[PDB]
Structures are given as C-alpha cells and as structure tokens.
Design a protein around this ligand. Sequence first.
Ligand SMILES: NC[C@@H]1O[C@H](O[C@H]2[C@@H](O)[C@H](O[C@@H]3[C@@H](O)[C@H](N)C[C@H](N)[C@H]3O[C@H]3O[C@H](CO)[C@@H](O)[C@H](O)[C@H]3N)O[C@@H]2CO)[C@H](N)[C@@H](O)[C@@H]1O
Ligand SMILES: [Mg+2]
Ligand SMILES: [Mg+2]
Ligand SMILES: [Mg+2]
Ligand SMILES: [Mg+2]
Ligand SMILES: [Mg+2]
Ligand SMILES: [Mg+2]
Lengths: 260, 183, 156, 38
Amino acid sequence: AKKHLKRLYAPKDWMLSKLTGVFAPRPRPGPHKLRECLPLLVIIRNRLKYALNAREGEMILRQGLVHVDNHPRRDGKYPAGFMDVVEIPKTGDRFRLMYDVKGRFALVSLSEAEAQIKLMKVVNLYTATGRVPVAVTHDGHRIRYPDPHTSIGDTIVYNVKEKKCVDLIKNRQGKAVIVTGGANRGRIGEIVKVECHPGAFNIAHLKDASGAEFATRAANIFVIGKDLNHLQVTVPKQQGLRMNVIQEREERLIAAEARK
Amino acid sequence: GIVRSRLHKRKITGGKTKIHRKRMKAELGRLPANTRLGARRVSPVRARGGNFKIRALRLDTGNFAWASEAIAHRVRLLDVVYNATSNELVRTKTLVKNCIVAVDAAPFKRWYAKHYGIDLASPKLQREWIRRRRNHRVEKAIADQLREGRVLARITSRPGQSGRADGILLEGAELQFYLKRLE
Amino acid sequence: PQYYHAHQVDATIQHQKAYQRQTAVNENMHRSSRKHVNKSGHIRYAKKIGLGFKTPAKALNGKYIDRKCPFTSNVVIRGRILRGIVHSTKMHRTIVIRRNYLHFIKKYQRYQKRHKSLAVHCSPAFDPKQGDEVVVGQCRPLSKTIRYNVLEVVSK
Amino acid sequence: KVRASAAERREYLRLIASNRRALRQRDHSKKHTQKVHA
RNA sequence: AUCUGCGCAUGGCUCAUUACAUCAGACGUAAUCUGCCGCAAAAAUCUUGCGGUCCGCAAAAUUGGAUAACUUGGCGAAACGCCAAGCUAAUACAUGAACCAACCGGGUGUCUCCAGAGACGCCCAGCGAAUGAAUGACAAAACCAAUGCCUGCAGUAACACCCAGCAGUGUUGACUCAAUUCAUUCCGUGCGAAAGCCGGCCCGGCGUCUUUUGACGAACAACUGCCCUAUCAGCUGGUGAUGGCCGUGUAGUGGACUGCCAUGGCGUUGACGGGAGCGGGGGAUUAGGGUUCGAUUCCGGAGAGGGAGCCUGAGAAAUAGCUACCACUUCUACGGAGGGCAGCAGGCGCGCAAAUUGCCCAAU
RNA sequence: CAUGGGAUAACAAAGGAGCAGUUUUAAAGGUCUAUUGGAGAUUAUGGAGCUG
Ligand SMILES: NC[C@@H]1O[C@H](O[C@H]2[C@@H](O)[C@H](O[C@@H]3[C@@H](O)[C@H](N)C[C@H](N)[C@H]3O[C@H]3O[C@H](CO)[C@@H](O)[C@H](O)[C@H]3N)O[C@@H]2CO)[C@H](N)[C@@H](O)[C@@H]1O
Ligand SMILES: [Mg+2]
Ligand SMILES: [Mg+2]
Ligand SMILES: [Mg+2]
Ligand SMILES: [Mg+2]
Ligand SMILES: [Mg+2]
Ligand SMILES: [Mg+2]
C-alpha cells in the first residue's frame, strides 16, 4: 500500500519544481486515475494562487469552499481530472479541467449554464441486480438507467445538478473527438476511420480542422460533439490546433519585441 | 508454512532453483479437511480479504439434485461407495468432490408420488398430473434403486471449501459406468 | 412405457477410472434443447473462441471428452497468439512446439540462430505430425509448463 | 428512495416497451400496405 | 486519564542474497483478492406498550447484560510486569423493529361457474452464498384434436380481466461470465433505519452495516533480452522429473499437492555445475563502430544479527509485532527479567578510505 | 502492435507415372427447412442437391 509520491515520480503536467521538497500530494483513489488527474491541492495552490503553501491550502478545502461537480470536496488529495467542473462560490469563479493542445491540464472559465453539464465517456456497460443496466464512466460514475442507445465508446451529457443524463453522443465516423492520451493529447479532430483489430487495440484515424491527419488508440479518443463547429463543450484557447514549433517560436519573439 | 510456489520445484532442465527470499503469506496452502460421514461439525477458516472458508468435518446430509426432474431434496448420506482417487478413501469413508455415495431416496419417492402422482388418488379435482406424465418417462435403473431404498449419487460440491455435501443423482451412462465397477 | 432407455456407455472414450464427462452440459437430459445438441445424436458443449478461429469438425461432431481444450471447455484463449513447428508428440495430448528466430547482434552486424521450445496442450481435434506448423493461443496455466494451447494446424 | 427507484424503472420500461411498439406498427403497416397492392 | 475508531504493511536505511531468478519494454488475469476513496444500490426479519392466560386494544419501538479509566486492598528487588473486589459509559458487545409499504412468481386445497375459467384459503417467494436445471438468441398445401379472431378464414406482438407494450433485446475478439426464472438449504462463518452523533430555525451536516462496482493496489503467469567458465557434457526421474485423469489446497491458475497411469522433458543454438553481484533508468569516454562503470537520490526486487514459525488485519510470513532455537548480550535483592542502530546523531573495531550524541516542523 | 513495398535472401513441400472437360437439355432409380391464422401431431407434392 503506497501512500507517498516522490516529486520526481509525480506526473510532469502538474509542474511541481524538483527543488521544493521531496514529496508531492499522492491523489487518493476516487474518480480519476493517479497518473491522469490533478489533485485539489495543486489546483488551489499551484494553478490558482489562492494559497501560498499547503497550510493555507487546507484552510480553504477543509472549510468546504471548493466544489468539484456541485459537491464540496474537503480533500486536498481528491483526484480531479478531465471534464471535471470546479466551482468556488466565494470568489465566484468556476472552471473546467480540459487538456490544452500541448497536453497539459487547462482551467477553462465557465458561465453558469455551461457549468451545469459535464460530458462523460462510457467505459463499461453491465446489468446490475434487478435487471437494471448501468453504465460505467471514466469519472467513476455509475449511471443506472442510461439512454438505451448507449454503447461503450459513447459520450453521455450529464448535468451534475439535477442528476439526469440529458443527452447522448454516439461514437461513429461523423463525430469530433478530443484526444486524452498519447502524443496527440489535447488535440481535437473529426473521426476519419476506425480500424478494429479484434483482440488488440482499436486504432482511430482523425483529421484536424486544418486538415492535419493523426491517429491514436480508440480508447484515447473522447467524443465531444457532432462536428468541429457543434462542440458540446467549450475547449481551451488554441481549440485543439497544434501550431508548428518553428512558427510558434517566431511569434513569441515578435510579440516580445513588439511589447518593447 | 505449506507453500504453493515453484521455488522448490526443479527447472525443466533439471536444475535446482536457488532461493533468495523468505516464504510469503500470499503463497500459502493449508492442511486438508478430510471430510467424513458423521454428525455435522465445521470449523471456519479466515481466508484472504477476511472471507470465511468453512471446513467440513463429519458431514451427514446435503441437498441432492435429480437433474432430469430439475429438483433437489435435502436427504441423508448413507454410505460412501466408490472413489476414483483411491480405494483407501472409500474405506475411511471420506467425502470429497466426485465421490459416489448412497442417499436416502425417501424424499425422492415421496416427491414422485406428489408430482406425477405415481407411487411405488386423493385430489380428484386437480389432474394436472395428466397434463404431465405423457411425454415424460423415467429411466429404469433409477426406478429400481429408488424403490430398493438407496440411490447412488455423485458429490458435486467441495466440502473442505464450502462445508456442504451437495450432489447429483447418477443417471444415464454415468450410472451404468459405476454400476459395472462395483458389481 | 414408463422406462426411458438411456444411452449406453461409450467405452472408446471411457478409460480413465472416473467417468469422463463435460462439466458444461448434462449428458442425461431427456428432452434436451437444440442449444448444445450437435448433428448426430448426442449432447455436446462446443464454444466459439475469439479471433476468427473456426472450430474444427471434431469438437462439434466428435466423441472425445477433453477438459483443458479451447473449444470444449472453460479454457479461454487470450493474450498472445503465436506460431511454431511441431517438435515432439510423445506426450499424451501435449506437444512441444519449436519457435526458431534470428537474433541480431548490434556489434557484429550479423544474425544468430536461436530457438525457444514451448510445451503446448494439443486437443484431440488435432493430430499434428512432426514438422507441422501450428498456431497457438495463450491460456491459463494448465500444467507446470503448459501456457499455450493449439488453435489451428497447418499440415506438412 | 426505494419507491422513487422503483418509479424510475417503470418509466424506463415505458421507454423500452414503446420503442418496441413503434416497430411493431411500422412493419404491420408496411406489410399491409403492400398486401393491398398485391 | 482511559474505552472506541482508523494508522503503525507506508516512509527511511542497506545491497547480503540472487541467472527459464530479479529487472526492462510489452502483454495476460475470462485464474484472482482488493480496507481507505468515488459514483451507486437497498420493500428479508410478527418488534414494542397496556390489560387479562394464550388473546384483546394500541403504536414517533422510552431494549438488555458487561468492562475500562476510577476507588479499595495490594504482590514483586525489578520488568513497555501482575492479581482480586467494588462502580460506570458507547458509534464497544449483544438483541431487535408490526402496520404504514409495492410489483412479480411457484407449489397447492374448498367454492361460484362451463361442457375448462374465476374467487377464497394454506405453504413458499429479499441481497449475498452452495448445488441442480432453464435462458444468455437468430443468421407450396392436406387432414384430426385442442385454440385464435371472423358472420369459412379477412389481419395478425405476446397475455383469460386488474398493467389492452410495466424488457421478445447484458457484454465481450471470446465466457460455464453479467443478470433472470425454480428446485433445494444457508444455523454463524454474512445483511440495524448504528436503538448513533451534531447543527440551523420541519430541514441540513456527518457517522455506519450489507450489496455492487470504478479507482489506488496486491498476487500470479511469462513474449524478447542478459558477465565469465568445457582444467564443468550430460541434467532430471525411487522421495515429482515431462505429461494425463479424478480430487485436494489456494484469494485464484497450476506437480503446488495425495492416489493412479503413461515415459517423458532439457542439452554443443553450452543444458548441468562452478566464479563474479541487486536489475534498469542512467554516468565516464567516444568521428563511426565501441569500451567500461551503475552500493548510491527515481522505479522495481530483497533483507532487518542468522534460520524458522505465526497471530492480527483489507494488506505482513511484519521485525522501533509475537514464539522458538543457534551465536553473542544487558539488569538482578539469584527468585528472575530482558536485548536487536543495514532509522537519525553518535561509540568501538576494521581499514587506503567517509562528518554534529546539533536546531525545527517554517516549507515538502 | 498496425499497415504497404516485393529486389535480395529464408522456411516449408515436391523429386514430377510418385499423375488433379466445361456447359445446354429432358429422363430413371434412390436420400435424412418455408408456407396452409397460431401452436401440437401426422401427410403426400415440390426446391436444391445423390449416383447409374
Ligand atoms: N529436495 C527438495 C524436495 O524435498 C522432498 O523431500 C524432502 C522431505 O522428504 C524431506 O524434507 C524434510 C521435511 O519433510 C521436513 N518437514 C523438514 C526437514 N528439514 C526436511 O529434511 C531435509 O532438510 C534438512 C535441512 O536441509 C536436512 O537436514 C535433511 O537431511 C533433509 N532431508 O527430505 C527430502 C529432501 O531431502 C521431495 N523429495 C522433493 O519434493 C524434493 O526433493
Ligand atoms: Mg484501540
Ligand atoms: Mg552489468
Ligand atoms: Mg486439476
Ligand atoms: Mg529503493
Ligand atoms: Mg546460525
Ligand atoms: Mg547510523
């Protein structure tokens, strides 16, 4: 039973500096994976500067002031990951955890109507006791009576206030996804062709808005809308478009010279 | 203690494996139950996860199923007749899985008179007996030992694991297999 | 009319001091459904394993009773699917396959013949001779050395 | 909460059983409208 | 202060062991256990009160016995040693909830009907578990019986009313699985609405059984790979070596193990035995090819003086846990009682060879 | 792990007597699902295949 993380064995997307202490806050089991989450001490202290250390950081959390998906989370080690909605009523800001196109976690600011729904991907389907078919989700939810057209690769729109699955997005050819793993993580694209290969990993071929073709495993894609215009959720400021490394290097030198 | 590892087994080359750890608790085994006939005495065993595994010592009764009729009846074990592992386990009358036993046969006859109405007259209103009994027929080797008093049967549960002596009645070629080996 | 006339003992398969039966299905049903009964006569359990492997003519219409078999048991084929050539068939219902490969040495820019031998459980659906090329699928441990189980035999 | 959970079964069972009803009566129309034609 | 609830299985040190082992990349667990945490689930149980001797009328169920701390008397040279009595708690332990309060099903005896249908009565019908059976799909007319609508067959989900669509449709590459139906019965080794606690002015924070699954893990299996040695060429198999059949044992698979049968398996593509010693990420040098080092911060494995064996727990074969022996070893009032720095400071040795018996939780 | 390119090589098998006639047409004999309102039980005709 591990209870510690070393700050070197912590994920790189958290961006904790190696010289500040040996340890990182090991996220508890919960909704999201340990490799694939951002625990609430890092959001309150390192992302947002509401807390200067971990001692000011539990003055916020243990008091019941941060809400992940409409419910107050008093754990600094609670795993918040992809598509979660983090509200704070006192400062009046609410955010969504999305991946930006460089693969890192990004806090997308939200309205009040956009902060009620979240988008969740089915990971398993089974029948529970009774004859109730429940749907297992990447965020750990077990929706008991989902839309009967739910398959495993699909996306359920959820509305975390009134816990009612308001919508369904099937996983087909004509849909748009966001990639949540691999080298292509954070990129958004239309689906082109899904190569099955039964017994092994499904490969999904994807085309971007510019036309850049790229592939991933189909367990890494997360469908978020009917097309790239009609996305069901708002995405970070690049909107899944990965610029060239040369062109994005030129633009920062131009912006820094034009600023002085 | 007792271990279930391959650390003591020789390699397929015949080489000895040199051991560089202590025994783990996660690789243990325990002493066998050796369940016999007798009045019921069980001892639970604390397994992994805190689950309980009920050792059966001295069992005398179980739920035996008659699979063509899809029913079961709690009957009493009479004798241990044939065991495929050793004839020495028959003599000490050990209950294991798949050993051949004789059971009581009285609830099976009484059920066969209550259902299908055949003895080995009182509800004249309900002859749903006639709605059955026409298509169905009963194997002769069953009906002989059913009225002889004891029926040969096969244990289908693991008693040292579950503390039960459940079973099934021998039918078909399986009964005719074991009747030749006895007599 | 009351008597049923059940099936007689098939002594060709019954050799083994306990009755050889399949645990999946009961042989003794009177009005057995069309679920598991095969073409000619008897009740049989046959299973379709995954990856586009066609079950043989035997294991559906055969008479043999095999446990540890991928088509007629609870043995599931999963993980690795490999190929080898049959080396020896001297064991009972088990073959040893030989996997011959070239090992490249980065220093001396040259390959090197190596081999791995695997004990593979062979169903009575199959009779492979030495030199036959087989396709094996990984299963659970079935003995001290058996992890694989033959799925298809390619003759000669 | 057991009554509310047994209520949300009885309306999931009208979502299933109506979709099976709508397929019965699109096919018994499309069978009978060609049986008139021949 | 003590009961109670979690924790002490992590961290930290060290690198002695160790070559079909460990370990790396990559897979498997459909062969399995899994506390904390996340989202869920939940209709079993003839209990109380009052009156009468088993019944009646009632209903916010106002349940029961014991221990600590403590007091008293103390034993003992002591001991992170102990005894007896007297008190008293619970979210400890034990007991236990009728009706409100459903649907659905099986087996079955009287009663109104017709030439089989209904009403009533009784036994049984909860989650989990065992065994057995059934599902867990599929890929032109003629005549007789029962039965369906028509006034002979137009057209047709299924079903004798209560509900005229209240599942004819689980998932996988694949299941003997998920789940459902009925047959039998679980005897403590499961299932309270904690018989619980706060707060606001009915409602809101918690806290807990069971059940179930994601998550953090555990355990096993092995695809490819690996220093030198032939002055090491045969290794294994009675007492398991390779396989097969019933079992057993396990958390589970399995020669892991009992019985029985077969005669196999490994090797000059270097087995077997011997020597060196944790394995990677990585370091040093390098035009290219390379040659070396890796006790050491991160990951994994192993150990706690050697060697066992256990208890408890979700997880240990735990060592700032227990039991024993061996080798050393400290206190004794000789009766006895203890030790385990490869934790951090230090100490003595050993060596060519490595620091402070320091301050602090301010940060991680 | 997936996929396409087919030069060079490789594994395997063969050792060449050790060898692998297609359609139209009507005829004979003989073999073990779908409809007729459903379901059950009998029942001839026929489709397509069998061989001389
Ligand atoms: N060789 C390991 C295995 O031991 C098994 O048999 C072993 C046992 O019969 C027996 O082992 C016993 C053991 O039962 C008992 N419970 C404990 C005892 N210490 C062991 O004894 C063995 O170990 C000790 C120390 O090494 C020796 O002094 C002793 O001579 C040796 N026979 O001796 C045999 C080993 O020499 C099987 N033969 C086989 O599985 C395999 O040989
Ligand atoms: Mg305590
Ligand atoms: Mg090395
Ligand atoms: Mg076995
Ligand atoms: Mg380490
Ligand atoms: Mg010693
Ligand atoms: Mg020290």
